[PDB]
Design an enzyme around this catalytic site. Structure first.
Site, PDB file in Angstrom:
ATOM      1  N   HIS A  41       0.604  -1.170   0.140  1.00  0.00           N
ATOM      2  CA  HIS A  41       0.084  -0.228  -0.089  1.00  0.00           C
ATOM      3  C   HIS A  41       1.067   1.211   0.068  1.00  0.00           C
ATOM      4  O   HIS A  41       0.033   2.396  -0.273  1.00  0.00           O
ATOM      5  CB  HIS A  41      -0.802  -0.015   1.405  1.00  0.00           C
ATOM      6  CG  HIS A  41      -0.716   0.125   2.671  1.00  0.00           C
ATOM      7  ND1 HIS A  41       0.005   0.651   2.824  1.00  0.00           N
ATOM      8  CD2 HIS A  41      -0.450  -1.081   3.536  1.00  0.00           C
ATOM      9  CE1 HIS A  41       0.524   0.875   4.303  1.00  0.00           C
ATOM     10  NE2 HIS A  41       0.464  -0.239   4.747  1.00  0.00           N
ATOM     11  N   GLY A 143       3.235   5.672  10.139  1.00  0.00           N
ATOM     12  CA  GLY A 143       3.934   5.616  10.550  1.00  0.00           C
ATOM     13  C   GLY A 143       5.372   4.221   9.843  1.00  0.00           C
ATOM     14  O   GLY A 143       6.167   3.782   9.715  1.00  0.00           O
ATOM     15  N   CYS A 145       4.375   1.454   9.998  1.00  0.00           N
ATOM     16  CA  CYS A 145       4.025   0.411   8.278  1.00  0.00           C
ATOM     17  C   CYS A 145       5.285  -0.120   7.876  1.00  0.00           C
ATOM     18  O   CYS A 145       6.316   0.737   7.313  1.00  0.00           O
ATOM     19  CB  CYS A 145       3.233   0.715   7.154  1.00  0.00           C
ATOM     20  SG  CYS A 145       2.061   1.900   7.817  1.00  0.00           S
TER      21      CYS A 145
HETATM   22  C1  LIG Z   1      -8.969   0.963  24.375  1.00  0.00           C
HETATM   23  N1  LIG Z   1      -9.215   1.548  23.437  1.00  0.00           N
HETATM   24  C2  LIG Z   1      -7.847   0.892  22.500  1.00  0.00           C
HETATM   25  C3  LIG Z   1      -7.495   2.134  21.443  1.00  0.00           C
HETATM   26  N2  LIG Z   1      -8.952   2.318  20.635  1.00  0.00           N
HETATM   27  C4  LIG Z   1      -8.560   3.420  19.902  1.00  0.00           C
HETATM   28  C5  LIG Z   1      -7.861   2.821  18.704  1.00  0.00           C
HETATM   29  C6  LIG Z   1      -7.868   3.641  17.658  1.00  0.00           C
HETATM   30  N3  LIG Z   1      -7.622   2.937  16.465  1.00  0.00           N
HETATM   31  C7  LIG Z   1      -8.121   4.100  14.642  1.00  0.00           C
HETATM   32  O1  LIG Z   1      -8.641   4.691  14.765  1.00  0.00           O
HETATM   33  C8  LIG Z   1      -7.043   3.419  13.200  1.00  0.00           C
HETATM   34  C9  LIG Z   1      -7.715   3.251  12.459  1.00  0.00           C
HETATM   35  C10 LIG Z   1      -8.948   2.891  13.105  1.00  0.00           C
HETATM   36  C11 LIG Z   1      -9.829   2.019  11.411  1.00  0.00           C
HETATM   37  C12 LIG Z   1      -9.454   1.109  10.349  1.00  0.00           C
HETATM   38  C13 LIG Z   1     -10.246   1.481   9.601  1.00  0.00           C
HETATM   39  C14 LIG Z   1     -11.191   2.309   8.895  1.00  0.00           C
HETATM   40  F1  LIG Z   1     -11.878   2.113   7.694  1.00  0.00           F
HETATM   41  C15 LIG Z   1     -11.547   2.768   9.977  1.00  0.00           C
HETATM   42  C16 LIG Z   1     -10.731   3.341  10.868  1.00  0.00           C
HETATM   43  N4  LIG Z   1      -7.502   2.472  11.847  1.00  0.00           N
HETATM   44  C17 LIG Z   1      -6.850   3.272  10.601  1.00  0.00           C
HETATM   45  O2  LIG Z   1      -6.414   4.997  10.625  1.00  0.00           O
HETATM   46  C18 LIG Z   1      -5.619   2.524   9.078  1.00  0.00           C
HETATM   47  C19 LIG Z   1      -6.768   2.639   7.928  1.00  0.00           C
HETATM   48  C20 LIG Z   1      -6.363   1.682   6.717  1.00  0.00           C
HETATM   49  C21 LIG Z   1      -4.617   2.413   5.872  1.00  0.00           C
HETATM   50  C22 LIG Z   1      -4.193   1.532   4.658  1.00  0.00           C
HETATM   51  C23 LIG Z   1      -4.938   0.096   4.935  1.00  0.00           C
HETATM   52 CL1  LIG Z   1      -4.292  -0.976   3.485  1.00  0.00          CL
HETATM   53  C24 LIG Z   1      -5.509   0.043   5.408  1.00  0.00           C
HETATM   54  C25 LIG Z   1      -5.993   0.206   6.651  1.00  0.00           C
HETATM   55 CL2  LIG Z   1      -7.440  -0.046   7.893  1.00  0.00          CL
HETATM   56  N5  LIG Z   1      -4.337   2.875   8.941  1.00  0.00           N
HETATM   57  C26 LIG Z   1      -2.904   2.423   9.582  1.00  0.00           C
HETATM   58  O3  LIG Z   1      -3.260   1.117   9.746  1.00  0.00           O
HETATM   59  C27 LIG Z   1      -2.080   3.746   8.909  1.00  0.00           C
HETATM   60  N6  LIG Z   1      -1.495   2.520   7.748  1.00  0.00           N
HETATM   61  C28 LIG Z   1      -1.138   3.443   9.983  1.00  0.00           C
HETATM   62  C29 LIG Z   1      -1.661   4.101  11.499  1.00  0.00           C
HETATM   63  C30 LIG Z   1      -2.430   4.971  10.901  1.00  0.00           C
HETATM   64  C31 LIG Z   1      -3.080   5.488  11.758  1.00  0.00           C
HETATM   65  C32 LIG Z   1      -2.616   5.183  13.799  1.00  0.00           C
HETATM   66  C33 LIG Z   1      -2.220   4.422  13.957  1.00  0.00           C
HETATM   67  C34 LIG Z   1      -1.577   3.262  12.835  1.00  0.00           C
HETATM   68  C35 LIG Z   1      -1.275   2.057  12.930  1.00  0.00           C
HETATM   69  N7  LIG Z   1      -0.878   0.929  12.938  1.00  0.00           N
HETATM   70  C36 LIG Z   1      -9.721   3.282  21.292  1.00  0.00           C
HETATM   71  C37 LIG Z   1     -10.145   2.384  22.489  1.00  0.00           C
END
Ligand SMILES: CN1CCN(CCCNC(=O)C[C@H](Cc2ccc(F)cc2)NC(=O)[C@@H](Cc2ccc(Cl)cc2Cl)NC(=O)[C@H](N)Cc2ccccc2C#N)CC1
Ligand SMILES: CN1CCN(CCCNC(=O)C[C@H](Cc2ccc(F)cc2)NC(=O)[C@@H](Cc2ccc(Cl)cc2Cl)NC(=O)[C@H](N)Cc2ccccc2C#N)CC1
Lengths: 304, 304
Positions: A41, A143, A145
């Site tokens: 990606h 970042g 990843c």
């Molecule tokens: C007890 N607590 C525990 C913690 N709880 C809070 C947790 C909050 N978590 C989030 O909101 C994370 C978010 C979730 C999401 C996922 C999907 C979607 F449609 C909508 C939302 N996921 C992201 O945004 C994902 C979105 C994504 C991008 C590219 C690909 Cl191919 C696949 C995906 Cl799925 N991005 C990443 O993974 C970044 N590549 C790397 C990255 C970016 C940002 C932050 C972390 C990372 C890592 N590592 C609260 C309760």
């Protein structure tokens, strides 16, 4: 004495971490011989991430679309190909720091070390277990990843994990180094749920044996139980069922401490039913399930 | 997201670990430029350990009494000297892998990474805190002496700990790299007790802020309290008193989460008085005190 979450020394992997940039997208890659491995990606823009066609996206790239940096030294890309969810970038220089390595796929319940990296620069090392639902409870920011998980066995590095994404629950998903995801996940920015998780019973028992080896004995009792009567209580507390092969895996710990596996199951049964009553085991107020029998043997003394 | 006990990448220190042998005694040394640093009790036999006179013991040695191995390659010792409780062995080869480094002495409540080594070979990496009573709760077996603790700040390695011994309670004691012990300990095989320990309050609060940054909010409340009324409850639960400088140290975390320090103290007050009622914080059923405010900031996202 003592028992700590212990990672493998990370130097052999630190020498392999590079930065891969495509457009305004930058993540980590793994540089072994003359190939750089990173999540595919990296070739996506913000719009493609919602539902990408990676075959289309890659065909529109050429070698010069990929900036690879090993430190500040730029690496010259001479070929690019896709293997499942990983991108392979051939470079003109073989990595002089390439360790003896192999690509292995791990089983749920097994552990590995994670070298967290950002912009090709390692920042921290910690221990992870592959949960029964194929996620890992890591510590990853945007970042990270392309950071990898590994074990080390006599200077051979077995790479088992490359990090791709964080699920909505905050747990982490990725692939083996052949690009095949652990669990029912895909590399696109959509909300995906893991299956229901369970506690790794054999690891909990290994950790109780670690506690005894270390002189923590308060939870022991004179009772024994059967494989099937314990599995009755395992189901009630969402613990995995115990097999005879798990008992055999625990044999060395059972032999070193003199406590038969089914005796320890009685103590675990009691811990599940009554708790700890304010006491701790190896510094935890919870039953820890991310140490394998191998992790215990590796870290703990050979004499109880 | 996520929060893990996270060590620094250990490669820069792995390149410095050697094996030092004197007689039948073998432990680890630290090879920087053309000097090897190791615990001086390597020069003791089994009888000397009970009450050694190290000045006498060293005068009876010569350079050829010291076997130093960097891997299998033997290092040629050309001089030896004592600095407090560390032995310095000058060798004819400067270590080509010497990082930018310095020797710093840490304060109780600060953390560092430990590279556990045996026979000059690194085996694992983990995070430690220097307890208020100057011990560390490590994981060390016989032969780990000479393993070092360190922090890394922009490719500079600050060495802060060299491991010497395990106390009867199973906790660990050692020196800075100038050979001066942390705490009221001496390098002889006698039973020594540490002073009474206490919980590092500022670290507990930093970890609660880590939990909020990660989205763990159940323990928050609308109450605030004063510096002095909280310190009343800190004394009752054997927590260190909170200073205004600790509040200022916690400022960035307080600003990022919008929760004033004295508001968080109210939540800590309640956690101390009522417990967790079966709930967990960042995966722990106990109040964790081995993460500094710096550790939280380093690992956690910059946006709550
Ligand atoms: C007890 N607590 C525990 C913690 N709880 C809070 C947790 C909050 N978590 C989030 O909101 C994370 C978010 C979730 C999401 C996922 C999907 C979607 F449609 C909508 C939302 N996921 C992201 O945004 C994902 C979105 C994504 C991008 C590219 C690909 Cl191919 C696949 C995906 Cl799925 N991005 C990443 O993974 C970044 N590549 C790397 C990255 C970016 C940002 C932050 C972390 C990372 C890592 N590592 C609260 C309760
Ligand atoms: C809840 N549980 C927690 C765990 N509890 C059990 C803990 C049991 N712990 C022990 O019995 C450890 C022992 C204690 C002792 C100490 C003094 C003395 F007079 C008599 C006894 N200490 C050792 O034997 C010390 C003795 C020694 C040698 C040289 C010097 Cl200069 C100073 C000392 Cl003091 N030896 C080492 O330190 C080895 N250099 C490296 C080493 C050897 C063996 C094991 C670990 C290490 C390390 N690291 C049970 C409850």
């Amino acid at each position: 004495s003592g028992f700590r979450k212990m990672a493998f020394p990370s130097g052999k992997v630190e020498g392999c971490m590079v930065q891969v940039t495509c457009g305004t997208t930058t993540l980590n890659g793994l540089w072994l011989d003359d190939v750089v491995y990173c999540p595919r990606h990296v070739i996506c823009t913000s719009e493609d991430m919602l539902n990408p066609n990676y075959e289309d996206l890659l065909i529109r790239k050429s070698n010069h679309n990929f900036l690879v940096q090993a430190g500040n030294v730029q690496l010259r890309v001479i070929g690019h190909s896709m293997q499942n969810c990983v991108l392979k970038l051939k470079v003109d220089t073989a990595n002089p720091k390439t360790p003896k390595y192999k690509f292995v796929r791990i089983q749920p319940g097994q552990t590995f070390s994670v070298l967290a990296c950002y912009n090709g620069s390692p920042s921290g090392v910690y221990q992870c277990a592959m949960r029964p639902n194929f996620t890992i409870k890591g510590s990853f920011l945007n970042g990270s990843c392309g950071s990898v998980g590994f074990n080390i066995d006599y200077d051979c590095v077995s790479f088992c994990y490359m990090h791709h994404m964080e699920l909505p629950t905050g747990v982490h998903a990725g692939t083996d180094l052949e690009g095949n995801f652990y669990g029912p996940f895909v590399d696109r920015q959509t909300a995906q749920a893991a299956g229901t998780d369970t506690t790794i019973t054999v690891n909990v028992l290994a950790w109780l044996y670690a506690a005894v080896i270390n002189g923590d004995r308060w939870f022991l009792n004179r009772f024994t139980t059967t494989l099937n009567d314990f599995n009755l209580v395992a189901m009630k507390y969402n613990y995995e069922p115990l097999t005879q092969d798990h008992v055999d895996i625990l044999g060395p710990l059972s032999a070193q401490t003199g406590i038969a596996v089914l005796d320890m199951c009685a103590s675990l049964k009691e811990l599940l039913q009554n708790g700890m009553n304010g006491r701790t085991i190896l510094g935890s107020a919870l039953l820890e399930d991310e140490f394998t029998p191998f992790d215990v043997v590796r870290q703990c003394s050979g004499v109880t």
